């Protein structure tokens, strides 16, 4: 075997990131994001490269999420050598070229996460959103806790949020959250014909309007810094409590978890 | 005869409901002292994991703030907390999930009650609204800022100047609020979303409604120039001539004098 | 002729500018036009409201006059370069203000929408931001407020892509209040107008001063915006494609970008 947690290909201009890990329904841990967060340095670098596509290798799944056994080690997720780019190396790491999630299936939890760190996201009509961690003792750390209400009507935001329920790719499109639902199996040709509709236009043009619209000095956006921070503080917290045990093992054991609030 | 607003126990949902259907469920201080003491409760007892708001009867979830004791100089807010704002609710954040289950009119201070709460399901006949600006008034309750950070800019602007109303249904497709459910059944479709969130981790529940609102020490930090700027403001408007004039008008229509 | 006129229509001010051969694009003219109405509006307390639209039956405003920008032009009203692109982008005034989009509203045109409170639309307008395809940027406020006004994601793709919205899914998704039948835009907007100006002059002003954050007469939440779109804006000037750009489109052909 041996194959990378996630593959980078070019198809012309654009460089196309596949997670690599059907085997375990595209979860993120830390060889994805080695494979995610070197493809996004090389194309922010490169300057053949337009448009990021970011896609999961086969039919069922973008991204399950979160990988539940390297939690379960209590493992990092990031890319080992740039903890300053979050979850799957993809986050927290901003680049001056247009990025497009290329929802494939399943997109939970951590899935959703890397849609809404995306500029754009065009889902097969079979995908799944949501941000379920709050029924496992754990929380939307890679961004979701406050992007969600960001991206989402306030209302309709903090109910996904708060009980952790997923979202039709079709209601994840008619809130906004999503640009665009299309015919099963043809995700990646129609981010692909999304990515050329942005890769026509003045590269200097596209990368300062991406700067602006996210706030970004010296390359960090300046604006969620207080929300990382914030969940930081959180997770320390959470990631001790006896209840963020009993979300996996309640889970394992088929039984309803018995919460005790600490 | 009777209190300002109860509170009762639905399993682990605490149920808060404003006692003044009479007054078509207005704010004041008799109501705010309830509200708060309930909110505060609530937040530290750990048998309560979330909780719902709602108006006594089949009429109004709440009228807004109580012009009758807007006219007589009385304050609206709980006489020991005022930081908590209007009702004691509208400033008054709680780790625990709040909905406001709005039964009827939820006009003015109503409209704000529904702003401040996390999330809203409401009656089919359920009507919202800023009406403050056709009364000399605004919407102090942190209706004026709180609005656009809850429906789209465009929309939200039209709805604060022209003190239009908005249909259950319309505020529904914008997003403001959650669920509109058939006559009758507000507080029983309230109790099942508390349901679907209360089976869930309470210290994850808690954490992300802190980080989704920026709270810091208690306190919802990016909130604090809107409150500013509303206070400066109101405490202006108070003292115009069009502040009286409003409220006043024997039902006729208002003279402005923009002083 | 003036680059935009001033009418009366009751408590209401209409500004329309005016340069319809012209594609009522903006330039000084029209910045000095439609910037000394503003601040006349501001301070006539008989005016209740103030309604932007644009001569003619084809367009609302084009954009940036683009034969101006070739000739580096300041677009802005000379004597208030604080008040940005239009006199109108970054000039807050107490009263509100009602866009009658009477057609084409691209680039240019859709920033003084989104610096407008409230926007009305002929059905047969258009909204966008197309400067990503002339290597520019939408400078005039629209790279920061197009995302405020829109979903993240729906915003990006506008901004992004530079292609146009119909008025009729800007109006489904909230960025303006309504779509009417061709040719009834100003009527529209005069009803709208109608609907706000019954109201209490003091709590409409201070609803707005609150709603925008208005300190000391400054919004202040949009400097960082602002200072972005600025030092941006500088650098992309100077480059090739900036120029490459606008040529294309003046010659009729597809653009070769260098990415200098």
Request: one cysteine or more; charged letters at 25%; aromatic letters at 4%.
């Given at each position: 075997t041996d194959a990378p947690g996630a593959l980078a290909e070019r198809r012309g201009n654009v460089m196309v990131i596949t997670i690599n890990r059907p085997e375990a329904r595209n979860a993120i841990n830390a060889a994805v994001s080695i494979g995610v967060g070197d493809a996004l340095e090389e194309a922010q670098h490169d300057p053949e490269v337009r448009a990021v596509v970011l896609t999961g290798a086969?039919?069922?799944?973008?991204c399950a999420g979160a990988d539940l056994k390297a939690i379960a080690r209590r493992e990092?997720?990031?890319?080992p050598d740039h903890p300053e780019w979050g979850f799957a190396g993809y986050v927290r790491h901003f680049i001056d070229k247009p990025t497009i999630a290329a929802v494939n299936g399943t997109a939970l939890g951590g899935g959703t996460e890397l849609a809404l760190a995306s500029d754009l996201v065009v889902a097969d009509e079979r995908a799944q959103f949501g941000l379920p961690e709050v029924k496992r003792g754990?929380?939307?750390?890679?961004?979701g806790v406050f992007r969600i209400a960001e991206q989402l009507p306030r209302k309709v935001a903090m109910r996904l949020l708060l009980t952790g329920e997923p979202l039709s790719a079709a209601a994840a499109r008619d809130w906004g959250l999503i640009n665009e639902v299309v015919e099963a199996g043809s995700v990646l040709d129609a981010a692909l014909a999304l990515a050329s509709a942005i890769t026509v236009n003045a590269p200097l043009s596209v990368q300062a309007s991406k700067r602006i619209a996210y706030g970004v000095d010296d390359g960090v956006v300046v604006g969620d810094e207080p929300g990382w921070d914030r969940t930081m503080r959180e997770m320390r917290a959470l990631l001790k409590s006896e209840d963020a045990k009993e979300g996996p093992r309640a889970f394992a054991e088929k039984r309803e978890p018995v919460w005790q609030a600490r």
């Amino acid at each position: 075997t041996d194959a990378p947690g996630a593959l980078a290909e070019r198809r012309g201009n654009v460089m196309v990131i596949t997670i690599n890990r059907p085997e375990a329904r595209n979860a993120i841990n830390a060889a994805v994001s080695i494979g995610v967060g070197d493809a996004l340095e090389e194309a922010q670098h490169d300057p053949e490269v337009r448009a990021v596509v970011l896609t999961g290798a086969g039919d069922k799944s973008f991204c399950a999420g979160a990988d539940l056994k390297a939690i379960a080690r209590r493992e990092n997720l990031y890319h080992p050598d740039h903890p300053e780019w979050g979850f799957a190396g993809y986050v927290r790491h901003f680049i001056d070229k247009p990025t497009i999630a290329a929802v494939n299936g399943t997109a939970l939890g951590g899935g959703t996460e890397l849609a809404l760190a995306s500029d754009l996201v065009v889902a097969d009509e079979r995908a799944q959103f949501g941000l379920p961690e709050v029924k496992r003792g754990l929380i939307a750390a890679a961004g979701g806790v406050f992007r969600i209400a960001e991206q989402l009507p306030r209302k309709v935001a903090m109910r996904l949020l708060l009980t952790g329920e997923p979202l039709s790719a079709a209601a994840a499109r008619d809130w906004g959250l999503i640009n665009e639902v299309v015919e099963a199996g043809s995700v990646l040709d129609a981010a692909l014909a999304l990515a050329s509709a942005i890769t026509v236009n003045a590269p200097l043009s596209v990368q300062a309007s991406k700067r602006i619209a996210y706030g970004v000095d010296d390359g960090v956006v300046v604006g969620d810094e207080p929300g990382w921070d914030r969940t930081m503080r959180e997770m320390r917290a959470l990631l001790k409590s006896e209840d963020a045990k009993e979300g996996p093992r309640a889970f394992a054991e088929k039984r309803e978890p018995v919460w005790q609030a600490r």
